[PDB]
C-alpha cells in the first residue's frame, strides 16, 4: 500500500498568515491526491481534487500544488474558520490511503498553568475507592508532562489523563489527570504530589497534600 | 428561388482534410456571423489524421480560415489502480459541428478509449468525444459521456448489457434553445444507439483537464433494450429538436435510426425523458430512412413540421425495375394532441445514385412570403452526377412539389457537394437568410447569398 | 365509291400512303383529270392504271437467321441456339402493324458456374465442418443436369477496421479469439480462394484448409463480397456461355450502403474490381458497402443469379431483399449448412423455371404487344413471361409491332432477349414511307408552271423555297 | 444539493453485527462510487471499501476482508455498511464518501455514524465533590463523574448559572466505564460565601444527581 507521510503534525499560527501543509507519498501518484478539512467536532468537507482543482464552494484562498510524490496545500490569509484538521488522501492506487493529519492551532503568548490538587472526597472513600485529581488549567503551548508522586516516588500505574481543545476565549489548553487507587492502598502512604513540566519554567510546578493532615 | 448562383463565396482548407464535412453558422457575443467548419481528416502534430475545426470570418471573397485549436495529444492517467487512455489518432474531429450562443461544439465520433487493470482491459473502442470552445474567451471543455472503466470480462458476464464502448458520441449533434447539448451515439448499447444530453453550462463547470473520467450529474442518457427491432439500428445516426407535444416548456427530440427493424429504418419523436411519442417507419428496406432529419414549420401554422431523408430509396419504374434515387418525406404536425399521419408530400430524386435527401436544411423564409422553405441535397445528382442542392418553398398546404431553384455543384466530380448543409441565417446582414454548402470531397465550402426576389 | 384515300384529297404519292395502309398511288400519265390517283389498288386497276406505275407497299416480315433450337447445350463451342429465329427483317408503312413470332427453349445439359461465397465469421464455426465433402457431393448431383460444371470458393467476414474489428491487445489482431481458449484467423474483408474450375476435388481440399475469423458486430460484410465476386470476371472465372450461380451463405444480418460511416468510411462503392494478386479485397477499409441498386446493376450486367442461402432466423430479411433485387432466389439453410447441397439444386431448378422476355433499343414510335404460350399450347394474351417450366421445355410468343406515323430515320433495329439468356432475336425494321417514283423526280420541270415546280410520280410539286 | 445522511450512532456488544446506512439526498445514489472510511483518534483515517450501486460490485482493503460488507439498494437510494464479529478496535466513527466530479475522488462526506462496542451495562455515574485542601485570590473547585455508561453526560454549575471560567473535560474510558471531570474558578470572596453545586445528568439511566461542594 502507498504510505502518506503528511507534515507537520500541527502548527501554531495567526490570522492572515500564509501557511503551507505538505504531503509525501512512498511513490509517484501523478497529482491523484485530495485534501480534506474537518472543523472541530464536525464532519469532513472536500477542498482539493486531482492535486490542484478546487471543490465547488471552497474559497479561492485555498490552493493545491505539487507533482510526482510531493504535494502541498496552501492557505493565503487565514480566516477564523480555517483553524481545523487537514488530511491528504491519495487515490492513485487501491486501497486509498490517508495522511496522518495536520491541526491548525491559534498562536498566542506562552502562559503558565494554574495547578490544583484535590484529595478523594468522603463519598468515594466510604465505597472502597480513592481518586486524587490534579487540574492544570489555561496554559500555552499545548506541550506538557504530568508526573504523579507518592511519598516522593513516581507512580505510573492507574493514571487517567484528559485534555481539552484550544479554548475559544483565551486560546489556551487545559488538562485533567486522575490517579485512582483502592481505599486500602491509598492509606499505606501519606504524601500525594503531581508535578507539572512546562516550557514556562525550568522548575516543575508542584502541588501536593498530606493524608489525614489538613 | 432567390439564392444568387452567379457570385458565390468559396472557403477552402487543406488538401485531403475533408474540410466541409460539417458546418454551421456562429454568432459571437456581438452577433457577428462566422462559419465553423469541421475537417475530420486534418493532420495533427504526429502528421497523423486527427481532424480539425476552422472558424471562418465572413468575407465576400472567402479564402483560408484560422484554426480553432484543440488538444490533440493522447492522454494517460494512472488512477485507482487502473490506467485510462484516450487515442485521438483518426478520431475525426470535426465530423459534426454545431453552434449555440457563443459556444462551438465539435465532435470526434471515432476517438478511441481503453482502460488497463493489470492484464485485463476494457477494450480499445470508439466511445467518441466532443470538444467545446468559447472562441472569444479561450475557454475549452470536453464531454465524453460513454467513457467507462468496466473491464471486458464483466460485459461478457452480463451479456453486454449497458455497453457504451462503441457509442461514437458526437456522430450527430444538436443544441436546444435552452442550451442542452444532445449527442447521437449510433453505436451505443452494442450498436442499438443511444442519445446523451447535458447542459452546456454544466459541461464547462464540471470539466477539468486530465481527469478523463468525470461525472456530469445533470446529464441524461437514453436506454438499452432487449427488443430485436432495435438491434443494429444506429439510433442516433441523426438528431434534431422541435416542439411536438403542445407544451412549450418541454423540448422534444427527433432521432434517426436508419437501420431500425432489420434495415426498415425509423424516426422517433421523444420527450426530454426519452419516452417515445411517435414513430415513423421506413417505406422500403435499406433506403436508410432516417439518414437525415429536419424540423421546421413549413406551412406557417406555428407547428413545427418533420422532414426525413431516405437517400437510397429505389423508385418503381416501367418493366418492374427499380432505381436508387432517394426520397424525402414531409410530415405536417396536426392541430393539438394527435399523431403525425401519413406523409403529406413525397419528394423523390431523379438522378440514379444521386442520394437525394442525404441532407435537408431548413432555410427559414427565403423569398420572404411568410412560409419557411428547405433545401434538399443530392450530393451525386444533376445530369453530370457532380451534385445538386434543390430548394422547395413552403406554402399553406405544405411544400411545393417542384423546386424553385436548383444549385449545380461548382466543384469537380467527387466533391460530395451538399453532403452537409446549413441555412436560415443572414450572414451579410441584408435581411435575407443564406445557405452554406459543404463539399468535403473538394475540401471547400460554398456560400450562397439570398438576394431580393426577381 | 369514294373512300378515305380519295376524300382526303392528297397532294403527292408520299401523302397518299400516309393516309392509311390500304391506300395506293397511280403514277401513270394517261389518267383522267377527274379520276383520283390515290385510291384502293383494286379501284386503280379498275380505272386503267398501268400496273408498273402502282405504288403500294405491303407491310411484311421475313426471317434472315432461323437456326434450329438445340436439343443439347452440352459440348459444342458455344454454338447452342436458345432463341429462334435469331434475326428477322421488318417492313412497315405509316400507322400499320405486322406480326411475327419467337421461340425460346430452356436447353438441356447447359453448362453451369457455381461460386460458393461463404460467411467465415465466428458464428459459422460449425458450418465449415459439414461442407468438407460438398464439392464431390455437388458434382454427383449436378452431373444429372449438366456435363459442364465448374465450382469456386470465396470467403468473407467484415471490414477489418474498428469497431467491427477487435483492436486490443496487440495479440488480438493476429488472433481475434485470444480472450477465449482457441485460435482463429486475423480478420479479413473478402478473400477469393478458388477460381471456377471443373476439378471438384480442389473445392474439397481448399475448404478443408479454411478456418473462421471473429469480429464484433453480428451483421457481416457479405455485400462487399457479392460485389467483388460479380465485377471481378477474370479472377472468379465466370464463363461466357454458362449459367452463373452465386451462392451466398450467412447466419446473420448484413451491412448495407451508408453503414460504413461507423468506421469512418464515407466514399461510395464504385462497383469496380479491387481484388489483386493477393486475392483480398483491398478497398475493404476505404470504400463503403455497396447499395442494393448498385448490386442489381452489376448482377444484371454479368448475368449473375444471386442465391441467398441463409438460416431461418434471417430468411424473412433476405426474402425481402430478394424482392428488391429481381432474379434473386432464396433457400433455407440449416444452422450448420448440412442441407446446402439440396438448396442449390432446388435453386437451379427454380432459376431455369422462367422465361421472361426483354426489349432493348426499341424506338419511340414503335409499340409492341405480346401473346404467350406456356404449358401445352395455352395462349395467354398480354403477357411476355412464362413460369413453372422445366429443363427442356419450350415456349413461344406472338408479337405485334404498331408504328405511329412515319419516323425520320428509315432504318433502325432493336432486340428481343430473355432475361439471363445468351441468344436473342434482332429485329431489323425498315420504314417504307416513300415511293419508288420519287427517286426519279424532275426538278425544275417544264410541265409545272414554267419551271417553278417539280414533277414527281405524275404530278407537280412546289419546289424548295416556295 | 448533495447531502449524505447516515444512520444514528450505534451502541453494540462484542461479537455481534451492525448495519450502518448512508441515504442519498438531492441526487441518485446510483450516480457515483460510494466509499466507507473509518476514523479513530490514534490510528487516524482508514479506507474500508467502495461500491458501484448501479451494479453492486465492491472493492475492499485486505485489512477489512471478513468484517466489512458493503451493499446498496437503489430503491431506497441508500448504501449500507455491515460489520461483523465486532471488537473494541471496531469502535470508531464511520463516514460514507462520494466524489464530486472526478470518478476516483473523495469530496462529499456524510456526517458520520458513531459506533461503540462494549459489554458494559447501563450504569449510573458516581458524582464526587472536589474541595481544595486547608489561600490565594483565585479559588478552584471540581466535580468527578466516574463509572458511568454509556455516553454522554451534561454537567453544569448552579444549574447553568455559573458558566464562565469553567473547564469540563472530555470523557475517558476506564475499564469499560466512562469517567469525566470538570473544574471551575472564581474569587475567594465567592466561595464558600456562595453555594456552588455540580449538576450531573445521565439520560441513559435517567439520573440527575447534584452535589454541593463543601470545604474541609
Ligand atoms: C419482410 O417483409 C414483410 C412484408 O412487408 C414484413 O411483413 C409485414 O410486417 C408488418 C409489420 O410487422 C405488417 O404490418 C402490420 O399489419 C398488421 C395487419 O396486417 C394484416 O394483413 C396481413 C397481410 O398478409 C396479414 O398477414 C396479417 O395477419 C394481418 O391480418 C397490423 O396489425 C399492423 O399494425 C399495427 O402495428 C403497427 C406497427 O407494426 C402500428 O403502426 C399500427 O398502428 C397497428 O398497431 C401492421 O400494419 C405486415 O402486415 C406484414 N406483412 C405480411 C405479409 O406479413 C416483414 O416484417 C419483413 N421482415 C423482415 C425481417 O424485414
Ligand atoms: C456468436 N456471434 C454472433 C453475434 C451475436 C450477437 C447478438 O445477437 N447479441 C444479442 C444482443 C446483445 C445486445 C443487445 C442490446 N442490449 C445489449 C446486449 C449483443 C449480443 C452480437 C454479435 C455477434 N457477433 C458475431 C461476430 C462474428 O460473426 O464473428 C459472433 O461471434
Ligand atoms: C393476341 O391475342 C388476341 C386475342 O386474345 C388477338 O386479338 C384478336 O386478333 C384477331 C386477329 O385476326 C383480330 O381479328 C381480333 O379482332 C382480335 N381480338 C381482340 C383484339 O380482342 C391479338 O391479335 C393477338 N396478338 C398477337 C400479337 O398475338
Ligand atoms: C401474323 O398473325 C396472323 C394472325 O394473328 C397469323 O395467322 C400469322 O401466322 C402471323 N405471321 C407469322 C409470320 O407468325
Ligand atoms: Ca414540448
Ligand atoms: Ca406546420
Ligand atoms: Ca418562403
Ligand atoms: Ca443574406
Ligand atoms: Ca460484423
Ligand atoms: Mg457472423
* Rounded CA Rg of chain B: 21
DSSP letter at C291? P
**C-alpha cell of B261?**
427493424
- At C4 the three-state DSSP class reads helix
Cβ(C356)–Cβ(C397) under 8 Å? Answer: no
Quote the CA–CA distance of A207 and A187 in Å, as a whole number. Answer: 19
Backbone angles phi, psi at A119, to 5 degrees: -65, 170
Quote the CA–CA distance of A77 and A60 in Å, as a whole number. Answer: 11
Quote the CA–CA distance of C426 and C360 in Å, as a whole number. Answer: 10
* Rounded CA Rg of chain C: 32
Number of domains comprising chain A: 2
* Rounded CA Rg of chain D: 23
Which one, of B96, B92, B95, B98, lies nearest residue B111 by Cα?
A: B92
Quote the CA–CA distance of D12 and C107 in Å, as a whole number. Answer: 97
Class level of CATH domain D126-212: mainly beta
**Can you give the length of chain D in residues?**
216
- At B353 the three-state DSSP class reads coil
CA atoms within 13 A on the CB side of C141: 14
**C-alpha cell of C120?**
467465415
Cβ(D63)–Cβ(D48) under 8 Å? Answer: no
Cβ within 8 Å of A, B 41-100: 77-81
Quote the CA–CA distance of C215 and C165 in Å, as a whole number. Answer: 5
Cβ within 8 Å of D, A 97-136: 97-98, 100-101, 114, 116-121, 123-124, 127, 131, 133, 135
Quote the CA–CA distance of C369 and A55 in Å, as a whole number. Answer: 85
The DSSP annotation for chain D comes to --EEEEPPPEEE-TT--EEEEEEEESS-GGGS-EEEEEEETTTEEEEEEEEETTTTEEEE-TTTBTTEEEEEETTTTEEEEEE-S--GGG-EEEEEEE-SSBTT---EE---EEEEE-----B--EEEEE------SEEEEEEEEEEEBSS--EEEETTTT--SSEEEPPPEEETTEEEEEEEEEEETTTTTTS--EEEEEETTTTEEEEEE----
Quote the CA–CA distance of B268 and B258 in Å, as a whole number. Answer: 11
Residue nearest to atom 2 of ligand 2 (CA): C123
Q: What's CA A150's distance to the chain center, in Å? A: 28
**Can you give the length of chain B in residues?**
454
Quote the CA–CA distance of B427 and B439 in Å, as a whole number. Answer: 19
Quote the CA–CA distance of B5 and B437 in Å, as a whole number. Answer: 12
Quote the CA–CA distance of B60 and B66 in Å, as a whole number. Answer: 16
Interface A:C, ≥3 CB–CB pairs < 8 Å: no
Cβ(B182)–Cβ(B105) under 8 Å? Answer: no
Cβ(C54)–Cβ(C13) under 8 Å? Answer: no
- At A214 the three-state DSSP class reads coil
Quote the CA–CA distance of A160 and A182 in Å, as a whole number. Answer: 15
Instruction: Answer yes or no: do A68 and A125 share one domain.
Output: no
Quote the CA–CA distance of D102 and A91 in Å, as a whole number. Answer: 11
CATH (domain of C286): 3.40.50.410
Which chain D residue is nearest to residue B211, measuring alpha carbons?
D102
Last residue before each break in chain B (C–N > 2.5 Å): none
User: D67 in the Ramachandran plot: left (φ > 0), alpha (ψ -120 to 50) or beta?
Assistant: alpha
User: Which of the ligands is closest to the CA of residue C185?
Assistant: 2
Cis amide leading into B357 (omega within 30): no
Quote the CA–CA distance of A88 and A99 in Å, as a whole number. Answer: 5
Quote the CA–CA distance of C322 and C337 in Å, as a whole number. Answer: 20
Domain D3-117 has CATH 2.60.40.10: yes
CB neighbour list of residue D212: distance below 8 Å, 6 or more residues apart: D129, D195, D196, D197, D198
Residue with the three cell numbers 441468344: C423
How far apart are the CA of C262 and the centre of ligand 9, in A?
Answer: 12
Q: Could you give the angle at the alpha carbon of D99 between the alpha carbons of D96 and D101, nearest 5°?
A: 165
- At C6 the three-state DSSP class reads helix
Quote the CA–CA distance of A13 and A103 in Å, as a whole number. Answer: 11
Q: C315 CB less than 6 Å from ligand 1?
A: no
Residues of A in contact with D61 (CB under 8 A): 1, 94-95
Quote the CA–CA distance of B26 and B66 in Å, as a whole number. Answer: 14
Which one, of C209, C187, C186, C183, lies nearest residue C129 by Cα?
A: C209
- Chains in contact with chain A (at least 3 beta-carbon pairs closer than 8 A): B, D
Instruction: Answer yes or no: do A156 and A205 share one domain.
Output: yes
Q: What are the beta bridge partners of residue A64?
A: A73
CATH (domain of A133): 2.60.40.10
Quote the CA–CA distance of D97 and D22 in Å, as a whole number. Answer: 9
Domain containing B178 equals 1-454
Atom of ligand 2 nearest to the CA of B163: 17
Is C423 annotated to bind a ligand? Reply is no
Cβ within 8 Å of A, B 186-205: 205
Instruction: Answer yes or no: do A97 and A173 share one domain.
Output: no
**C-alpha cell of A53?**
482543482
Domain containing A92 equals 4-106
Cβ(A19)–Cβ(A11) under 8 Å? Answer: yes
Query: Parallel, antiparallel, or unpaired: how do β-strands C112-119 and C149-156 relate?
Result: parallel
- Helix or strand run (H / E) with residue C292: helix C292-301
- Helix or strand run (H / E) with residue C236: helix C233-236
Termini Cα distance of chain B: 9
Residue with the three cell numbers 456530469: B216
Backbone angles phi, psi at C342, to 5 degrees: -65, -35
Binding-site residue ranges of B = 243, 245, 247, 250, 252, 297, 299, 301, 303, 305, 365, 367, 369, 371, 373, 426, 428, 430, 432, 434
Percentages (nearest 5) of helix, strand, coil residues in chain A: 5, 50, 45
Q: What are the beta bridge partners of residue C151?
A: C114, C197
Domain containing C190 equals 112-352
At how many degrees (to 10) do helices C222-231 and C292-301 cross? 30
Quote the CA–CA distance of B381 and C167 in Å, as a whole number. Answer: 37
Pick the last residue of a domain from A106, A125, A147. A106
CB contact under 8 A, D102 and B211: yes
**C-alpha cell of B290?**
432516417
DSSP letter at B158? T
Q: Could you give the angle at the alpha carbon of C140 between the alpha carbons of C138 and C146, nearest 5°?
A: 90
User: Which of the ligands is closest to the CA of residue B299?
Assistant: 6
Is C126 annotated to bind a ligand? Reply is yes
CB contact under 8 A, D103 and B206: no
The reply to whether B209 touches chain D by the CB within 8 Å rule is no
Q: How was this structure determined?
A: X-ray
Interface A:D, ≥3 CB–CB pairs < 8 Å: yes
Domain with CATH 2.60.40.10 in chain D: 3-117, 126-212
Which letter, b or e, does each residue of B93-132 get, where b requires 16 or more Cβ atoms within 10 Å of its Cβ? bbbbbbbbebbbbbbbbbbbbbbbeeeebbbbbbbbbbbb
Q: Which long-range contacts (CB under 8 A, 24 or more apart) does D22-28 make?
A: D22/D78, D22/D79, D22/D80, D22/D81, D22/D96, D22/D110, D23/D76, D23/D77, D23/D78, D24/D77, D24/D78, D24/D79, D25/D1, D26/D1, D26/D2, D27/B217, D27/D2, D28/D74, D28/D77
Cβ(C152)–Cβ(C234) under 8 Å? Answer: no
Q: Could you give the angle at the alpha carbon of B77 between the alpha carbons of B94 and A8, nearest 5°?
A: 135
Q: What are the beta bridge partners of residue D211?
A: D198
Backbone angles phi, psi at B440, to 5 degrees: -60, -30
Quote the CA–CA distance of C338 and B265 in Å, as a whole number. Answer: 33
- Helix or strand run (H / E) with residue B98: strand B96-100
**C-alpha cell of B136?**
472569444
Amino acid at each position: 500500500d502507498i504510505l502518506m507521510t503528511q507534515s507537520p503534525s500541527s502548527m501554531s499560527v495567526s490570522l492572515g498568515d500564509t501557511v503551507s501543509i505538505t504531503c509525501h507519498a512512498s511513490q509517484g501518484i501523478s497529482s491523484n491526491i485530495g485534501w480534506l478539512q474537518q472543523k472541530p467536532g464536525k464532519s469532513f468537507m472536500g477542498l482539493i481534487y486531482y492535486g490542484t482543482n478546487l471543490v465547488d464552494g471552497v474559497p479561492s484562498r485555498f490552493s493545491g500544488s505539487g507533482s510526482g510524490a510531493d504535494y502541498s496545500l496552501t492557505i493565503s490569509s487565514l480566516d477564523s474558520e480555517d483553524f481545523a484538521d487537514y488530511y491528504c488522501v491519495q487515490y492513485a492506487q487501491l486501497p486509498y490511503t490517508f495522511g496522518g493529519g495536520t491541526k491548525l492551532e491559534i498562536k498566542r503568548a506562552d502562559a503558565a498553568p494554574t495547578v490544583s490538587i484535590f484529595p478523594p472526597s468522603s463519598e468515594q472513600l466510604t465505597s472502597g475507592g480513592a481518586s486524587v485529581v490534579c487540574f492544570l488549567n489555561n496554559f500555552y503551548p499545548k506541550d506538557i508532562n504530568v508526573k504523579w508522586k507518592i511519598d516522593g516516588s513516581e507512580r505510573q500505574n492507574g493514571v487517567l489523563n484528559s485534555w481539552t481543545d484550544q479554548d475559544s476565549k483565551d486560546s489556551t489548553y487545559s488538562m485533567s489527570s486522575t490517579l485512582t487507587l483502592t481505599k486500602d492502598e491509598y492509606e499505606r502512604h501519606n504524601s500525594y504530589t503531581c508535578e507539572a513540566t512546562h516550557k514556562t519554567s525550568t522548575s516543575p510546578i508542584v502541588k501536593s497534600f498530606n493524608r489525614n493532615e489538613c | 428561388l432567390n439564392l444568387d448562383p452567379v457570385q458565390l463565396t468559396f472557403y477552402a482548407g487543406p488538401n485531403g482534410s475533408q474540410f466541409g464535412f460539417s458546418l454551421d453558422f456562429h454568432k459571437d457575443s456581438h452577433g457577428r456571423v462566422a462559419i465553423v467548419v469541421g475537417a475530420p481528416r486534418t493532420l495533427g502534430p504526429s502528421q497523423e489524421e486527427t481532424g480539425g475545426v476552422f472558424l471562418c470570418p465572413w468575407r465576400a471573397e472567402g479564402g483560408q480560415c484560422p484554426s480553432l485549436l484543440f488538444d490533440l495529444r493522447d492522454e494517460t492517467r494512472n488512477v485507482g489502480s487502473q490506467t485510462l487512455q484516450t487515442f485521438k489518432a483518426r478520431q475525426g474531429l470535426g465530423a459534426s459541428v454545431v453552434s449555440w450562443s457563443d459556444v462551438i461544439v465539435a465532435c470526434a465520433p471515432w476517438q478511441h478509449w481503453n482502460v488497463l487493470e493489470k492484464t485485463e482491459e476494457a477494450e480499445k473502442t470508439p466511445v467518441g468525444s466532443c470538444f467545446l470552445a468559447q472562441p472569444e474567451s479561450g475557454r475549452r471543455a470536453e464531454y465524453s459521456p460513454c467513457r467507462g472503466n468496466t473491464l471486458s470480462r464483466i460485459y461478457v458476464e452480463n451479456d453486454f448489457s449497458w455497453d457504451k464502448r462503441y457509442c461514437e458520441a458526437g456522430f450527430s449533434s444538436v443544441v436546444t434553445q435552452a442550451g442542452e447539448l444532445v449527442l447521437g451515439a449510433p453505436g451505443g448499447y452494442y450498436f442499438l444507439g443511444l442519445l446523451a444530453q447535458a447542459p452546456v453550462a454544466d459541461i464547462f463547470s464540471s470539466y477539468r483537464p486530465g481527469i478523463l473520467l468525470w461525472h456530469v450529474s445533470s446529464q441524461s442518457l437514453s436506454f438499452d433494450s432487449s427488443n430485436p427491432e432495435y438491434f443494429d439500428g444506429y439510433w442516433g445516426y441523426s438528431v434534431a429538436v422541435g416542439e411536438f407535444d403542445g407544451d412549450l416548456n418541454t423540448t422534444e427530440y427527433v432521432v434517426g435510426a436508419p437501420t431500425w427493424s432489420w434495415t426498415l429504418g425509423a424516426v422517433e419523436i421523444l420527450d426530454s425523458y426519452y419516452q417515445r411519442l411517435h414513430r415513423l417507419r421506413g417505406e422500403q428496406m435499406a433506403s436508410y430512412f432516417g439518414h437525415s432529419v429536419a424540423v421546421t414549420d413549413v406551412n406557417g401554422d406555428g407547428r413545427h413540421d418533420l422532414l426525413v431523408g431516405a437517400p437510397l430509396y429505389m423508385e418503381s419504374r416501367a418493366d418492374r425495375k427499380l432505381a436508387e434515387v432517394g426520397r424525402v418525406y414531409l410530415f405536417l404536425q396536426p392541430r393539438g394532441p394527435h399523431a403525425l399521419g401519413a406523409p403529406s408530400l413525397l419528394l423523390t430524386g431523379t438522378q440514379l445514385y444521386g442520394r437525394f435527401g442525404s441532407a435537408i436544411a431548413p432555410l427559414g423564409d427565403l423569398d420572404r412570403d411568410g412560409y419557411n422553405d428547405i433545401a434538399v441535397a443530392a450530393p451525386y445528382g444533376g445530369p453530370s452526377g457532380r451534385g445538386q442542392v434543390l430548394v422547395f418553398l413552403g406554402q399553406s398546404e405544405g411544400l411545393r412539389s417542384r423546386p424553385s431553384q436548383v444549385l449545380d455543384s461548382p466543384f469537380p466530380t467527387g466533391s460530395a457537394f451538399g453532403f452537409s448543409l446549413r441555412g436560415a441565417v443572414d450572414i451579410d446582414d441584408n435581411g435575407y437568410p443564406d445557405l452554406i454548402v459543404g463539399a468535403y470531397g473538394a475540401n471547400q465550402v460554398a456560400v450562397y447569398r439570398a438576394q431580393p426576389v426577381v | 365509291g369514294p373512300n378515305i384515300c380519295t376524300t382526303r384529297g392528297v397532294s403527292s404519292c408520299q401523302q397518299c400512303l400516309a393516309v392509311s395502309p390500304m391506300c395506293a398511288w397511280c403514277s401513270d400519265e394517261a389518267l383522267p383529270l377527274g379520276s383520283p390517283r390515290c385510291d384502293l389498288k383494286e379501284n386503280l386497276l379498275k380505272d386503267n392504271c398501268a400496273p408498273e406505275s402502282i405504288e403500294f407497299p405491303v407491310s411484311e416480315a421475313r426471317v434472315l437467321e432461323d437456326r434450329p433450337l438445340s436439343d443439347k447445350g452440352s459440348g459444342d463451342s458455344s454454338q447452342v441456339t436458345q432463341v429462334s429465329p435469331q434475326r428477322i427483317a421488318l417492313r412497315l408503312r405509316p400507322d400499320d402493324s405486322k406480326n411475327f413470332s419467337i421461340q425460346v427453349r430452356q436447353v438441356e445439359d447447359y453448362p453451369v458456374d457455381i461460386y460458393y461465397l461463404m460467411d467465415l465469421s465466428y458464428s459459422m464455426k460449425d458450418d465449415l465442418w459439414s461442407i468438407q465433402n460438398l464439392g464431390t457431393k455437388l458434382a454427383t448431383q449436378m452431373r444429372k443436369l449438366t456435363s459442364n460444371l465448374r465450382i469456386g470458393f470465396g470467403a468473407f467476414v467484415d471490414k477489418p477496421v474498428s469497431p467491427y474489428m477487435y483492436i486490443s491487445p496487440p495479440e488480438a489482431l493476429e488472433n481475434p479469439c485470444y480472450d477465449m481458449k482457441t485460435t482463429c484467423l486475423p480478420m479479413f474483408g473478402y478473400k477469393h480462394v478458388l477460381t471456377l474450375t471443373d476439378q471438384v476435388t480442389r473445392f474439397n481440399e481448399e475448404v478443408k484448409k479454411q478456418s473462421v475469423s471473429r469480429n464484433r458486430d453480428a451483421p457481416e460484410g457479405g455485400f462487399d463480397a457479392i460485389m467483388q465476386a460479380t465485377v471481378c470476371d477474370e479472377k472468379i472465372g465466370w464463363r461466357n456461355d454458362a449459367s452463373h450461380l452465386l451462392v451466398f451463405t450467412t447466419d446473420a444480418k448484413t451491412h448495407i450502403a451508408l453503414d460504413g460511416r461507423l468506421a469512418g468510411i464515407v466514399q461510395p462503392n464504385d462497383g469496380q474490381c479491387h481484388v489483386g494478386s493477393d486475392n483480398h479485397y483491398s478497398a475493404s477499409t476505404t470504400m463503403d458497402y455497396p447499395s442494393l441498386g448498385l448490386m442489381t446493376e452489376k448482377l444484371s450486367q454479368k448475368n449473375i443469379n444471386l442465391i441467398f442461402a441463409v438460416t431461418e432466423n434471417v430468411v424473412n430479411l433476405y426474402q425481402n431483399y430478394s424482392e428488391l433485387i429481381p432474379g434473386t432466389t432464396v433457400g433455407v439453410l440449416s444452422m450448420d449448412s448440412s442441407n446446402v447441397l439440396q438448396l442449390i439444386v432446388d435453386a437451379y431448378g427454380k432459376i431455369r423455371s422462367k422465361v421472361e422476355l426483354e426489349v432493348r433499343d426499341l424506338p419511340e414510335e414503335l409499340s409492341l404487344s405480346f401473346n404467350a404460350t406456356c404449358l401445352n399450347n395455352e395462349v395467354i394474351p398480354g403477357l411476355k413471361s412464362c413460369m413453372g417450366l422445366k429443363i427442356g421445355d419450350t415456349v413461344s410468343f406472338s408479337i405485334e409491332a404498331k408504328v405511329r406515323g412515319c419516323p425520320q430515320e428509315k432504318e433502325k433495329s432493336f432486340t428481343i432477349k430473355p432475361v439471363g439468356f445468351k441468344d436473342s432475336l434482332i429485329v431489323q425494321v425498315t420504314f417504307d414511307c416513300d415511293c419508288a417514283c420519287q427517286a426519279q423526280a424532275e426538278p425544275n420541270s417544264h410541265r409545272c408552271n414554267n419551271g417553278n415546280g417539280t414533277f414527281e410520280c405524275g404530278v407537280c410539286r412546289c419546289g424548295p423555297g416556295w | 444539493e448533495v447531502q449524505l445522511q447516515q444512520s444514528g450512532a450505534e451502541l453494540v456488544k462484542p461479537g455481534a453485527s451492525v448495519k450502518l446506512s448512508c441515504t442519498a439526498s438531492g441526487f441518485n445514489i446510483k450516480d457515483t462510487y460510494v466509499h466507507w472510511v473509518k476514523q479513530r483518534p490514534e490510528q487516524g483515517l482508514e479506507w474500508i471499501g467502495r461500491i458501484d450501486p448501479a451494479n453492486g460490485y465492491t472493492k475492499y482493503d485486505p485489512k477489512f476482508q471478513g468484517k466489512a460488507t458493503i451493499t446498496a439498494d437503489t430503491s431506497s437510494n441508500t448504501a449500507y455498511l455491515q460489520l461483523s464479529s465486532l471488537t473494541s478496535e471496531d469502535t470508531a466513527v464511520y463516514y460514507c464518501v462520494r466524489p464530486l466530479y472526478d470518478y476516483y475522488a473523495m469530496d462529499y462526506w456524510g456526517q458520520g455514524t458513531s459506533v461503540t462496542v462494549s459489554s458494559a451495562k447501563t450504569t449510573a455515574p458516581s458524582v464526587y465533590p472536589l474541595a481544595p485542601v486547608c489561600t490565594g485570590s483565585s479559588v478552584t473547585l471540581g466535580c468527578l463523574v466516574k463509572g458511568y455508561f454509556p455516553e454522554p453526560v451534561t454537567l453544569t454549575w448552579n444549574s447553568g448559572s455559573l458558566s464562565s471560567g469553567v473547564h469540563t473535560f472530555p470523557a475517558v474510558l476506564q475499564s469499560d466505564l466512562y469517567t469525566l471531570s470538570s473544574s471551575v474558578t472564581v474569587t475567594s470572596s465567592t466561595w464558600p460565601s456562595q453555594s456552588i453545586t455540580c449538576n450531573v445528568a445521565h439520560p441513559a439511566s435517567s439520573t440527575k444527581v447534584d452535589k454541593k461542594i463543601e470545604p474541609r
